[PDB]
Design an enzyme around this catalytic site. Structure first.
Site, PDB file in Angstrom:
ATOM      1  CE1 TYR A  43     -62.997  79.439 -29.170  1.00 34.25           C
ATOM      2  CE2 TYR A  43     -63.584  78.557 -26.827  1.00 34.25           C
ATOM      3  CZ  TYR A  43     -63.511  78.360 -28.397  1.00 34.25           C
ATOM      4  OH  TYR A  43     -64.448  77.595 -29.080  1.00 34.25           O
ATOM      5  CB  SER A 116     -68.190  75.451 -25.163  1.00 31.25           C
ATOM      6  OG  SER A 116     -68.393  75.250 -26.478  1.00 31.25           O
ATOM      7  CE1 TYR A 117     -60.541  72.440 -27.645  1.00 33.31           C
ATOM      8  CE2 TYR A 117     -61.872  72.515 -29.594  1.00 33.31           C
ATOM      9  CZ  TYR A 117     -60.771  72.304 -29.213  1.00 33.31           C
ATOM     10  OH  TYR A 117     -59.745  71.757 -29.869  1.00 33.31           O
ATOM     11  CD1 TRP A 165     -66.215  77.403 -32.463  1.00 28.50           C
ATOM     12  CD2 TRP A 165     -64.979  75.652 -33.332  1.00 28.50           C
ATOM     13  NE1 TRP A 165     -64.944  76.759 -31.866  1.00 28.50           N
ATOM     14  CE2 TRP A 165     -64.261  75.867 -32.391  1.00 28.50           C
ATOM     15  CE3 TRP A 165     -64.528  75.013 -34.488  1.00 28.50           C
ATOM     16  CZ2 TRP A 165     -63.190  75.264 -32.191  1.00 28.50           C
ATOM     17  CZ3 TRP A 165     -63.170  74.260 -34.278  1.00 28.50           C
ATOM     18  CH2 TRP A 165     -62.660  74.472 -32.982  1.00 28.50           C
ATOM     19  CG  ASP A 258     -75.705  74.300 -25.550  1.00 29.94           C
ATOM     20  OD1 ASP A 258     -75.107  75.367 -25.657  1.00 29.94           O
ATOM     21  OD2 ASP A 258     -75.116  73.048 -25.455  1.00 29.94           O
ATOM     22  CG  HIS A 286     -72.956  77.132 -27.071  1.00 36.22           C
ATOM     23  ND1 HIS A 286     -72.869  75.717 -26.458  1.00 36.22           N
ATOM     24  CD2 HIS A 286     -71.773  77.621 -27.362  1.00 36.22           C
ATOM     25  CE1 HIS A 286     -71.667  75.657 -26.486  1.00 36.22           C
ATOM     26  NE2 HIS A 286     -70.855  76.602 -26.866  1.00 36.22           N
TER      27      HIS A 286
HETATM   28  C1  LIG Z   1     -67.386  76.110 -27.824  1.00 34.64           C
HETATM   29  O1  LIG Z   1     -66.153  76.664 -27.162  1.00 34.64           O
HETATM   30  O2  LIG Z   1     -68.157  76.780 -28.888  1.00 34.64           O
HETATM   31  C2  LIG Z   1     -68.295  75.896 -29.809  1.00 34.64           C
HETATM   32  C3  LIG Z   1     -69.709  75.789 -30.572  1.00 34.64           C
HETATM   33  S1  LIG Z   1     -69.456  75.027 -31.988  1.00 34.64           S
HETATM   34  C4  LIG Z   1     -67.743  74.623 -29.483  1.00 34.64           C
HETATM   35  C5  LIG Z   1     -66.816  73.672 -30.488  1.00 34.64           C
HETATM   36  S2  LIG Z   1     -66.505  72.093 -29.803  1.00 34.64           S
HETATM   37  O3  LIG Z   1     -66.726  74.686 -28.253  1.00 34.64           O
END
Ligand SMILES: *C1(O)O[C@H](CS)[C@@H](CS)O1
Ligand SMILES: *C1(O)O[C@H](CS)[C@@H](CS)O1
Ligand SMILES: [Cl-]
Ligand SMILES: [Cl-]
Ligand SMILES: [Cl-]
Ligand SMILES: [Cl-]
Ligand SMILES: [Cl-]
Ligand SMILES: [Cl-]
Ligand SMILES: [Cl-]
Ligand SMILES: [Cl-]
Ligand SMILES: [Cl-]
Ligand SMILES: [Cl-]
Ligand SMILES: [Cl-]
Ligand SMILES: [Cl-]
Ligand SMILES: [Cl-]
Ligand SMILES: [Cl-]
Ligand SMILES: [Cl-]
Ligand SMILES: [Cl-]
Lengths: 574, 574
Positions: A43, A116-117, A165, A258, A286
């Site tokens: 991002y 997250s990612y 997403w 989450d 999230h």
């Molecule tokens: C995060 O950066 O937001 C997404 C929620 S589906 C996830 C994707 S692996 O990672």
């Protein structure tokens, strides 16, 4: 000078295949080399404000003498190559850690943190077995992408997460253009429309027809929608089986609402015996870390405690990257926000020692249909053989309200369930009003005796705290897609009319049901768009038109010979 | 190297009195001196993530060759001296700009940006008339601290804002200790309790008794609670009268549900003739910039557009600090999020040219008490002389729901008003259901003919958009404390029973009332804890016990001889 640092932008780092990823280097003013922290971000590494509020005040790490490296993942923003989610991240992380370890300013100790990612990528980095990687801190993440966030332990598609997403990534791919295009302005509009109405986007049949998303990000269909089974394409990117062989310390954060909660907790259990693992779980979704929701306020202590998190991460890295053997003195192994009493509490392990996995059996006089039915929950087996019956119609699925939603109204986890309580396909079972508190903290599942008129269908279970004022607040929930009842790998269909005993993995929670409340379970066959809707045909669900789908007469069996129950992780502290 | 920078921490800057304030310097790698941006912050200059998400991605300014200086205000965190809100900020800003201008890395051009307190301080800086200060960008701020945030144009205390903020500062003063104290742990607990229940804290009588807050921050009583009148102590810190003499360009941001909205807009009007002023107004509250609320979603375009804001600020500073005369080509003078149609729209001025300030008169058959009364709004003067009457009881004030709340549930600006619609002291007047859209964009006020049995009381007015489904969504509102009906400076009491014509300043809004909706106005005598409750005695309100207060029989007069109305800023675009 102590406290001081410099930032170098767009340092190009070559991978094994010659493709170059861009990084930013935040390096302290230092005599010699320093310990380093790596963050791998899709991002935009420049956009530090977007994610960091969900993470740590990490400039404190830099002021305290850590270097921090933030990287654009392959094919995004300043990096070269083509972006495809997940597939390149093991190798790119490996190559990047090696490059860092080779730098003059790296002292041979590397760590990672992020949400997250930026959390998933740390598990992908940790399986490279690069010696210099000493600790990771994956927040709201998973080591099995099928189980979170794309599908789940039930074998249903997390369609709202998928399309939401993909639309976000889509938006980025556009706003980050190498060379601007005529269709960009209009594509941007279509992406916003998906994001303002994810349930709407999820409703088009056949689901696999995604003209915009399929064109911008082919993976959305090629990988995700086309692979309903937890098959080789998923196992290829899964890290989970390799976790038990690692000896990497991991500081793991999760949220009760989450999307990743189930998998985050699983990662803790998988690493805890071999290395120093830590766990922090707050009442967050999230996209909502505030502790405040439409019908449930958790108190200001529930707000993501960013400064305490920073301090904890710093002690963690001081212990494992700096060898400061007392750095984690007085830091708990496990720290949970216990809902109900709405307080943080320290623990020695997860699952909690002295968890009593306790059946609460479905029962009652008359039908359990709606919240005004006669459905009960009791620690005693029901005396008389009964069955609750409803019609599940794919064209009218039970709408999603809170729980672990990601992009479709993902900011109201503990949602009041009342708006669906008069529905005939929502079966409700509750205890009497409690006069003594009941704490439920741990993994939650249901064992149901079910039957269908269809050769495949879904069954959902939802744990609910009913407040004195009538609020029926969602806690945790799950789904079983019947073809996957036995395995996510080799699905088989069912016989219409045969009774099956099935397990529903309802993830986890921490809640004290206070005096005046009720323990309540909602049972149904849909939960849309959190999960995609079963067509009740046995077909390739994502390829079916709404018109092609069938209704199902579904049935929950309960009594002495069919003792349907929820298994609650009871905690007793006097 | 372009894009690159260094950060130096805790550079101590001496003020005229020898007291030293700490700054952080974000300086680009540059041949020669550069343009500089200053941010004056009472929430720790180190903690950049806390505020910046409400502002700009300003590291982009640094990558693009601006220096950024972030300062701890006097007496907080790394700065020396004693903290008292507002009083030292003119001089400290002046001294700090001078110091910056004298540095080797400053090219003689200085600007400022920031939100809230970081916005108020820019107005305080701009009145120093330091030549080198070329532009400011005050977001969600005021140049008159009495009018926002501490009191208001009505002469009522913004008690929830006062106690909420004081508790936050209190918390900081503790967590930032020079030397830790035994009472810190317990004080922290009491501060959290105020912040979890600001309405509760605001309810203690006498209001002026604040044992915890008065001890930590004496100013809370000494300045604010003790000065109900807009007197010399307030005028001393006010900047507003000096604004019309300035020629400083200002990029001004506001939110329709932001406590500062009224004063933010006033600052634009005051500077627009003498310098390049810009205006951006989104549908935000002070603590909720997301565009999402419990009962009203504004769409993803409503989310605070941080990247577009960054680009706009950069062009603004490029124009005024770098002399790039075309830098603001194609940038609108005014950009408003127009609610209802829920779209951003460009405009040439604020107030909008071709605003029709239009009376909508209160009327109806029978009493207007409750939402099921016969209250109407109409562009025609009512035909028959009538009066609506209710009892206002200070022990039961009308609860605050959305509007411009800051700390007591300040995250639900466009709140559904239905929970107070059955109350007898809430008078409701509405138009018929609209078949054609009506746009209301501008400053809003009401002119009411009122009378009381008391020698002082409050009157409130609230503009509401009634949706087809029944949601009664708050837009803007105000209050008049009757002793201040004529002046905030020299209050006088009223005669019981005499009819008065009073003005209620209802701040501003931008809303299209779409076909199927109604224009609705709620009238009452309280709005607690947004505003403190009138005691109906004529006494020093903040010094009175609940028991000492009186109830009031209040009355709204309406008809040919008493044409009570709301003045709506009607916009017509075909
Ligand atoms: C995060 O950066 O937001 C997404 C929620 S589906 C996830 C994707 S692996 O990672
Ligand atoms: C901003 O930082 O929050 C406060 C809301 S009352 C305000 C005080 S002037 O500044
Ligand atoms: Cl270098
Ligand atoms: Cl590539
Ligand atoms: Cl609550
Ligand atoms: Cl706590
Ligand atoms: Cl236990
Ligand atoms: Cl009962
Ligand atoms: Cl039958
Ligand atoms: Cl059987
Ligand atoms: Cl220097
Ligand atoms: Cl001082
Ligand atoms: Cl809405
Ligand atoms: Cl728009
Ligand atoms: Cl106009
Ligand atoms: Cl009508
Ligand atoms: Cl009378
Ligand atoms: Cl008269």
């Amino acid at each position: 000078v102590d406290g001081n640092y410099s930032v170098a932008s767009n340092v190009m780092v070559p991978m094994r295949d010659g493709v170059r990823l861009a990084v930013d280097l935040y390096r302290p003013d230092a005599d010699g080399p320093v310990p380093v922290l790596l963050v791998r971000n899709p991002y935009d590494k420049f956009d530090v404000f977007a994610w960091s509020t969900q993470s740590t005040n990490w400039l404190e790490f830099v002021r305290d003498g850590y270097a921090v490296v933030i990287q654009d993942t392959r094919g995004l923003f300043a990096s070269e190559g083509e972006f495809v989610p997940h597939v390149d991240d093991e190798a790119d992380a490996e190559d990047t850690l090696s490059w860092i370890l080779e730098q003059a300013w790296c002292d041979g100790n590397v760590g990672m943190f992020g949400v997250s990612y930026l959390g998933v990528t740390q598990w992908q980095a940790a399986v490279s077995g690069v010696g210099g990687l000493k600790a990771i801190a994956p927040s709201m993440a998973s080591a099995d992408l099928y189980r979170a966030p794309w599908y789940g332990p039930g074998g249903a598609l997390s369609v709202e997460a998928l399309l939401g997403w993909s639309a976000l990534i889509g938006t980025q791919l556009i706003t980050s253009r190498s060379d601007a295009r005529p269709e960009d302005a209009a594509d941007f509009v279509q992406l916003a429309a998906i994001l303002n109405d994810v349930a709407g986007a999820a409703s088009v049949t056949p689901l696999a027809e995604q003209p915009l998303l399929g064109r911008l990000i082919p993976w959305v269909i090629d990988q995700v929608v086309d692979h309903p089974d937890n098959d080789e394409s998923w196992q290829s990117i899964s890290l989970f089986e390799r976790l038990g062989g690692l000896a990497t310390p991991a500081l793991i954060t999760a949220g009760w609402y989450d999307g990743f909660v189930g998998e985050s907790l699983r990662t803790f259990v998988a690493v805890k015996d071999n290395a120093d693992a830590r766990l922090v779980v707050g009442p967050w979704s999230h996209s909502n870390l505030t502790g405040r929701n439409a019908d449930r306020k958790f108190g200001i202590a529930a707000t993501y405690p960013i400064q305490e998190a920073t301090t904890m991460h710093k002690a963690f890295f001081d212990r494992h990257l700096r060898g400061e053997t007392d750095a984690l003195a007085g830091v708990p192994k496990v720290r949970l926000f216990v809902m109900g009493i709405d307080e943080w509490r320290d623990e020695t392990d997860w699952p909690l020692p002295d968890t009593a996995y306790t059946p609460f059996y479905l029962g009652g006089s008359g039908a359990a249909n709606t919240s005004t039915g006669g459905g009960t929950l009791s620690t005693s087996i029901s005396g008389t053989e009964s069955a609750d019956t409803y019609l599940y119609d794919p064209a009218d699925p039970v709408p999603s309200l809170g729980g672990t939603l990601l992009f479709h109204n993902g900011d109201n986890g503990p949602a009041d369930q009342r708006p669906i309580h008069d529905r005939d396909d929502v079966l409700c079972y509750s205890t009497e009003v409690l006069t003594d508190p009941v704490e439920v903290t741990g993994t939650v599942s249901a064992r149901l005796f079910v039957s269908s008129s269809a050769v495949d269908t879904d069954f959902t279970a939802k744990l609910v705290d009913v407040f004195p004022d009538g609020r029926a607040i969602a806690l945790c929930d799950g789904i079983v897609r019947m073809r996957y009842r036995e395995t996510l790998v080799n699905p088989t269909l069912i016989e219409a009319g045969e009774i099956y005993e099935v397990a529903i993995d309802m993830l986890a929670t921490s809640n004290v049901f206070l005096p005046g409340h009720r323990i309540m379970v909602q049972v149904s066959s849909s939960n849309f768009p959190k999960y995609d809707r079963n067509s009740n045909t046995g077909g390739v669900i994502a390829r079916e038109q709404l018109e092609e789908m069938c209704t199902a007469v579904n049935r929950i069996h309960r009594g002495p010979e069919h003792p349907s129950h929820i298994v609650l992780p009871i905690i007793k502290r006097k």
